[PDB]
Amino acid sequence: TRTKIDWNKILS
Amino acid sequence: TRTKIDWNKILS
Amino acid sequence: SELEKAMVALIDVFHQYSGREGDKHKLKKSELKELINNELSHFLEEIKEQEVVDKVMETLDNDGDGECDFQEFMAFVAMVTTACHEFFEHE
Amino acid sequence: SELEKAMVALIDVFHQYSGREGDKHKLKKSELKELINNELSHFLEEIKEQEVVDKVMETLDNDGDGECDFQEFMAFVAMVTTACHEFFEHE
């Protein structure tokens, strides 16, 4: 969630 | 999530 | 006191736009995007191009994978924020 | 424009309180509760009694099950809201 932005597929 | 408030254990 | 204005601040955004067709409590690619480019024209961050947004709103599509309501956008500003704004808020 | 003030509005709340010991970016039962009773004295909703809060902050404990940072409270106001505020916002 830190650098994964937590969005999901868009930013991944 | 609607009536489950989504919190978790506190409200459940 | 920000917690009281920020809370409803989000609601008003969706409550103002969402609710045109009739059922309300939902926002389409046009309702969300336009709104974002309407309210967030200088500070997007969570929305870059037009194509990305479509995927963005889709990345949170929880309802019926159709559009984004108040619960979808609420988790958005929060997910997108809580994640990067966490330690990236600096940069 | 609310999205810009509401966004940082949350941050400031944690950035103001969280960061006393040194490491910062974290809030304990004292930092969160007191803050809530400090900023949200007339409009709590997500916080009833003192005992409940402890469980409340614990219900979101994701870090190390120790305290709540910016990512824990961000998901809180959002989780607690996105859920009930969704259709309960009326009542």
Burial class (CB in 10 A: 0-12, 13-18, 19+), C74: buried
Is domain C1-91 annotated with CATH 1.10.238.10?
yes
Nearest residue of D to residue C77 by CA position?
D7
Whether C37 contacts C54, CB under 8 Å: no
CB atoms within 10 A of CB D41: 9
Domain segments of chain C: what residues? 1-91
Closest C-alpha among B5, D73, B7 to residue C2: D73
Neighbours of chain B (3+ CB pairs under 8 A): D
**CA distance readout (Å), C44 to C11, C33, C38, C40:** 18, 11, 10, 5
Query: Are C83 and A5 inside 8 Å of each other by CB?
Result: yes
Residues, chain B = 12
Whether C82 contacts D14, CB under 8 Å: no
Cα–Cα distance measured from residue C18 to residue C21, given in angstroms and rounded to the nearest whole number: 9
Provide the sign of the torsion angle of the four alpha carbons C44, C49, C52, C54, taken in this order.
positive
Cα–Cα distance measured from residue C1 to residue C27, given in angstroms and rounded to the nearest whole number: 28
End-to-end CA distance of chain D: 27
- Chain D residues whose CB is inside 8 A of the C4 CB are 40, 43
Cα–Cα distance measured from residue C46 to residue C49, given in angstroms and rounded to the nearest whole number: 10
In the numeric block, the tokens 């009694």 are attached to D49
Residues, chain D = 91
CB contact D58 to B (< 8 Å)? yes
Query: Are D4 and C43 inside 8 Å of each other by CB?
Result: yes
- Chain C residues whose CB is inside 8 A of the A2 CB are 83, 86-87
CB atoms within 10 A of CB D42: 7
Q: Which pair of structure tokens corresponds to residue D73?
A: 């409270």
